Design a protein around this ligand. Structure first.
Ligand SMILES: CCc1cc(-c2ccncc2)cc(CC)c1Nc1cccc(CN2CCCOCC2)c1C(=O)O
Ligand SMILES: O=C(O)CCC(=O)C(=O)O
Length: 434
């Protein structure tokens, strides 16, 4: 296989005919005022220590990202990739001083790139000519930006790009997942300073999915260049980042698919679960209104959602955003208290199944409704505990140390149920086989 750069004669027609949805807006098209502000904001975030490597999962293996990152975006919004949910450092939208000024700068960059994207999508539809406007607006309505930094000098060995001879990869071939269908992605690239591609300059690489026959494109990225993946390009093509010699930042603006990924969403889910609880007073005497299978099933599913998708995801990062912001401190305190009440709900259901007067047919209905949720709860707890205590997780500093919260010992009387549910789950299974 082979690749094409601006040095190759065929590069320009190949871009035109096979990559019409890839746009490059070079540094000269963007204002020098915006350049200075955005680049100063990158260095502020880096100096204050706001950028961290994510500990992600790829095919059962715990891996640090080669890039250090931070998610900036709408208040209460999240972005999930590689089984790792990032929580936004909020930018000042309608309705810490140096850090908040940088978050305001990246909102200003978001506003600019949104307008550039809309114009590019309007021109794309105009070219395709030779309901529509609402789709273009929503596909360019960037709700987050995920910032990136890498010093390639710090890495002892970078992987060779395997298919096209593109050289050293900073980031391997992938799609950006958890984005709205056909939504655009806009990237501001900030580099700090003759056979194939130039090894000292940063590039973004592109290939068609499933395809190593068709030669890939490697687009050089100089200081302040912007590139846009329009419409279905992100889905139909993989991209990689090829390393240059110097350090480089980027701001990758996305329309995150947050239908089950906002604070407002999960709080509303928690309140739905607690509709089955008598809510006169907050105490340990949790009594339930109904034991209808469907209501109990739902309750235990929400219990799992708030525990694994929100609490354990957040505390796995180890109060890391605490440096940049305290926006999630009270929400996470509230979600844990809501989760604690749902531990009382589970205990109340387990108390009901053991009651003497309950006929066995009603009992077995309840067991069938909750067993899948409790089984998954046991399995995910074991996974999350082991993920927190992995070799690579232990090597991180105290500021970035993963916590397995919530966690409690067998002797802890404040919690109604044990952390380990193995004996409870095996007993409930046994009862069904009676
Ligand atoms: C910011 C990191 C990232 C995000 C996403 C990603 C996935 C889905 N949605 C958004 C982003 C995909 C990749 C490619 C593996 C990356 N890259 C990575 C994420 C974690 C770890 C690594 C490092 N090694 C390197 C040697 C080759 O084996 C693969 C793992 C990479 C990588 O660049 O390869
Ligand atoms: O720009 C970067 O270096 C990494 C961001 C990226 O390419 C991605 O996550 O898809």
């Amino acid at each position: 296989g082979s690749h094409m750069t601006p040095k190759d004669d065929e590069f320009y027609q190949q871009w035109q005919l096979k990559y019409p949805k890839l746009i490059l807006r070079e540094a000269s098209s963007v204002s020098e005022e915006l350049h200075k502000e955005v680049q100063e904001a990158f260095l502020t975030l880096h100096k204050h220590g706001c950028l961290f490597r994510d500990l992600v999962r790829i095919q059962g293996k715990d891996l640090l990202t080669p890039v250090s990152r931070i998610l900036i975006g709408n208040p209460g919004c999240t972005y999930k990739y590689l089984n790792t949910r990032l929580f936004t450092v909020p930018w000042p939208v309608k309705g810490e001083a140096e850090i908040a000024a940088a978050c305001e700068t990246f909102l200003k960059l978001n506003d600019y790139l949104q307008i550039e994207t809309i114009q590019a999508l309007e021109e794309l539809a105009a070219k395709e000519k030779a309901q529509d406007e609402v789709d273009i607006k929503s596909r360019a309505a960037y709700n987050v930006t995920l910032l990136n930094f890498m010093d390639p000098q710090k890495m002892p060995y970078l992987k060779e790009e395997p298919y096209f001879g593109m050289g050293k990869m900073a980031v391997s071939w992938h799609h950006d997942e958890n984005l709205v269908d056909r939504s655009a992605v806009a990237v501001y690239s900030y580099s700090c300073e003759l056979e194939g591609r130039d090894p000292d300059i940063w590039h973004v690489g592109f290939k068609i999915s499933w395809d190593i026959e068709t030669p890939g494109l490697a687009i050089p990225l100089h200081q302040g260049d912007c590139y846009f993946m329009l419409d279905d390009l992100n889905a139909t093509h993989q991209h990689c980042v090829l390393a240059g010699s110097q350090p480089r930042f980027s701001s990758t603006h996305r329309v995150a698919e947050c239908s089950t990924g906002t604070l407002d969403y999960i709080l509303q889910r928690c309140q739905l679960a607690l509709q089955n609880v008598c809510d006169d007073v907050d105490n340990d005497d949790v009594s339930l209104k109904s034991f209808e299978p469907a209501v109990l099933k739902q309750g235990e599913e929400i219990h799992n959602e708030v525990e694994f998708e929100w609490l354990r995801q957040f505390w796995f990062q180890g109060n890391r955003y605490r440096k940049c912001t305290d926006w999630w401190c009270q929400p996470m305190a509230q979600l844990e208290a809501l989760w604690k009440k749902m531990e009382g709900v589970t205990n109340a259901v387990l108390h009901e199944v053991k009651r003497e007067g309950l006929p066995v047919e009603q009992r077995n209905e309840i067991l069938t409704a909750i067993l899948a949720s409790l089984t998954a709860r046991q399995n995910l707890r074991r996974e999350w505990h082991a993920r927190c205590q992995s070799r690579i997780a232990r090597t991180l500093p105290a500021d970035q140390k993963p916590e397995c919260r919530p966690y409690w010992e067998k002797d802890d009387a404040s919690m109604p149920l044990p952390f380990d549910l193995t004996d409870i789950v095996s007993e409930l299974r046994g009862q069904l086989l009676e």
